[PDB]
């Protein structure tokens, strides 16, 4: 591991790792392609707005790290980094992607999260090993339909973008365990979402959402579940048959209510309900046997039923900021006497 260099370059055979970080580089010397065993290289926080054609001569070359630079394209030597595995290109001013981003053949994870992106380039079928894909603080408003192609991507994330609309391509990549479409514009989750029988955590947080489809029910593999800052007025009974969920944040919506099907969520350990307009809860929220935290603050309740005495693993509950009268606040202490209460 080499930090400068000048001295990487009197020895150039001998350099495995090179950090040229928070050097002040404006360009990246010709020079650097003396290093022919070179395995990654490190140029975060620099003003690089090109690389030069001389990485090309770096055929050994696993990892580029290029995190906060002032990069606008790639050059098409890039097509000679056979062997490259790892591709990081963010917090830059990247338009568009070079046609031979296509060429790393040999790429799984691609970092894009913070550029200029308008469109994803319809040459990312050809990144077959590609397993994380990262597009998040983009202007992107649609996927190619090329990107259907990625069976053996695992991780997508789409957050901070100029989505309107859920890409129906997103239903191809049957092999997502988790899926990040925070702060978009979404309306309505469709049911291409249930295609992906793999999916462990699904953020859609600070998005339009009114709707989820009532094939929401076939993500048994489902864990997590961000629903937070939307426009949620009614929950389907079928989010109730999502048997593996474990963290349900519903916080900052518009639900009167919760379905009785909530009672099926066995392993559900963390429930956020906080700014919302429920009036009622239902009796079935005592079947929730292995709910540990449940946040209420800042809705209608006036009771609660006393089957809350059932959720003998609650540990915290927050409940400021509702209807409740010093009479039913004293009565729900009584419920239950192991769980943190929180009225004011
Ligand atoms: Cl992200
Ligand atoms: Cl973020
Ligand atoms: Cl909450
Ligand atoms: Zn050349
Ligand atoms: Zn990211
Ligand atoms: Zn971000
Ligand atoms: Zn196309």
Redo the contacts with the bound molecule.
């Keep these: 591991t080499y930090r400068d260099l000048t001295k990487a370059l009197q020895n150039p055979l001998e350099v495995r790792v090179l950090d040229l970080s928070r050097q002040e580089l404006k360009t990246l010397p010709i020079e650097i392609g003396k290093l022919k065993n070179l395995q990654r290289l490190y140029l975060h926080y620099n003003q690089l707005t090109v690389l030069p054609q001389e990485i090309e001569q770096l055929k050994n070359l696993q990892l580029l790290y290029l995190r906060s630079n002032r990069l606008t394209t790639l050059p098409k030597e890039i097509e000679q980094l056979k062997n490259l595995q790892v591709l990081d290109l963010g917090s830059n001013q990247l338009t568009v992607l070079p046609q031979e981003i296509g060429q790393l053949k040999n790429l799984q994870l691609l970092y894009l999260?913070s550029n200029r992106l308008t469109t994803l380039s319809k040459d990312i079928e050809q990144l077959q090993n590609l397993k994380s894909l990262?597009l998040?603080?983009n202007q992107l408003t649609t996927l190619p339909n090329e990107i259907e192609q990625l069976k053996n991507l695992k991780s997508l994330?789409?957050?901070?973008n100029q989505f309107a609309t859920f890409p129906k391509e997103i239903g191809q990549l049957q092999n997502l365990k988790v899926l990040?479409l925070?702060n978009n514009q979404i309306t309505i989750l469709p049911n291409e979402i249930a295609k992906l029988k793999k999916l462990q955590y699904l953020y859609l947080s600070d998005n339009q959402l009114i709707t989820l489809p009532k094939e929401i029910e076939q993500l048994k593999n489902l864990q997590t579940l961000d629903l937070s800052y939307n426009q949620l007025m009614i929950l389907p009974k079928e989010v109730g048959q999502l048997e593996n969920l474990q963290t349900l944040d519903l916080r900052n919506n518009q639900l009167k209510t919760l379905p009785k099907e909530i009672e099926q969520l066995k392993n559900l350990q963390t429930l956020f309900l906080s700014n919302n307009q429920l009036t009622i809860l239902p009796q079935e929220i005592g079947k929730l046997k292995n709910l540990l935290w449940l946040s209420l603050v800042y809705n209608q309740l006036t009771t609660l039923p006393n089957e809350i005495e059932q959720l003998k693993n609650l540990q915290t509950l927050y409940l400021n900021n509702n209807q409740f009268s010093s009479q039913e606040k004293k009565r729900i202490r009584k419920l239950l006497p192991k769980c943190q209460i929180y009225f004011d």
């Excluded at 994330?157 to 901070?160: A, D, F, K, M, V």
């Design positions: 999260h990262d998040s603080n994330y789409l957050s901070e990040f925070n």
